């Protein structure tokens, strides 16, 4: 997170850390959506162009964290993965369309003041909040600058959703309906963005009708970090809700 701030304790209790076994390292962000299911970006696990192909046994999940490098004794919970599922039409060949994946935990995790699931949007929630100009919130342990460094605790930044055409007009990559873009415009004089390390974390909004937090996006890609005229791109969770439903319904819950 570029131009963000330290989170408050317990501010994003659904925030998850995808952690590399060995070498022991921060791989990406992720989110807790039930006692046994985690949501992230497919590219955190699979990206043939860079020779990226992780497996269940390669990773660890850390939940309830605040501090980036410390092992938070008595606070954080660590789980192992039972199975990973990537969308069948995830497109790593060209634009990362459908960048989404679910992970089934080995055993359910218990909730606490620091660990609690976020909600997935319904059609109406989507309809009402996913509008240009509305702000959402991004979280993560990713880099602080495009070239710098790394933060000490979880960072947070609030960003506005951008009109599709502006999004299209900012890049040469081809945009799909399974994606949206967010950030301040150059004139705006307010900055912020996701960066390396933030990938696969949650883009969330708070409902003004029922006081709950919904995850509308997954951090997907950007061209650099925090550049002017550029924007971050996110997977559109609601448009992929069916695949989520299906998988959870067929392989437990």
């Amino acid at each position: 997170i570029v131009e963000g701030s330290d989170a408050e304790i317990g501010m994003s209790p659904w925030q998850v850390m995808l952690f590399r076994k060995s070498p022991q390292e921060l791989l990406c962000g992720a989110s807790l959506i039930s006692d046994r299911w985690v949501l992230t970006a497919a590219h955190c696990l699979l990206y043939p162009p860079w020779d990226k192909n992780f497996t269940e046994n390669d990773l660890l999940v850390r939940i309830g964290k605040h501090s980036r490098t410390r092992y938070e004794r008595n606070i954080e919970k660590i789980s192992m993965l039972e199975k990973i599922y990537i969308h069948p039409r995830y497109n790593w060949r060209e634009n990362l369309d459908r960048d989404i994946a679910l992970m089934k935990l080995k055993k359910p995790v218990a909730f606490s003041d620091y660990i609690h699931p976020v909600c997935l949007p319904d059609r109406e929630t989507a309809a009402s909040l996913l509008q240009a100009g509305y702000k959402g919130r991004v979280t993560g342990w990713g880099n602080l600058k495009e070239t710098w460094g790394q933060p000490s605790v979880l960072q947070v930044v609030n960003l506005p959703i951008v009109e599709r055409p502006v999004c299209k007009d900012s890049t040469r990559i081809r945009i799909t309906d399974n994606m949206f873009c967010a950030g301040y415009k150059p004139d705006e004089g307010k900055r912020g963005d996701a960066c390396e390390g933030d990938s696969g974390g949650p883009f969330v909004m708070k409902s003004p009708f029922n006081n709950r937090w919904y995850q509308m996006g997954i951090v997907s890609w950007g061209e650099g970090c925090d550049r002017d005229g550029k924007y971050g791109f996110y997977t559109h969770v609601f448009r992929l809700k069916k695949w989520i439903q299906k998988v959870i319904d067929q392989f437990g819950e």
């Binding site: 192992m80 990938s199 950007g222």
Partner: peptide, 15 residues
């Protein structure tokens, strides 16, 4: 993806 020192954890967690 952007197109352009961790405390050890306890021995169990692995497997």
């Amino acid at each position: 993806x952007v197109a352009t020192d961790y405390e050890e954890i306890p021995a169990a967690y692995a497997x």
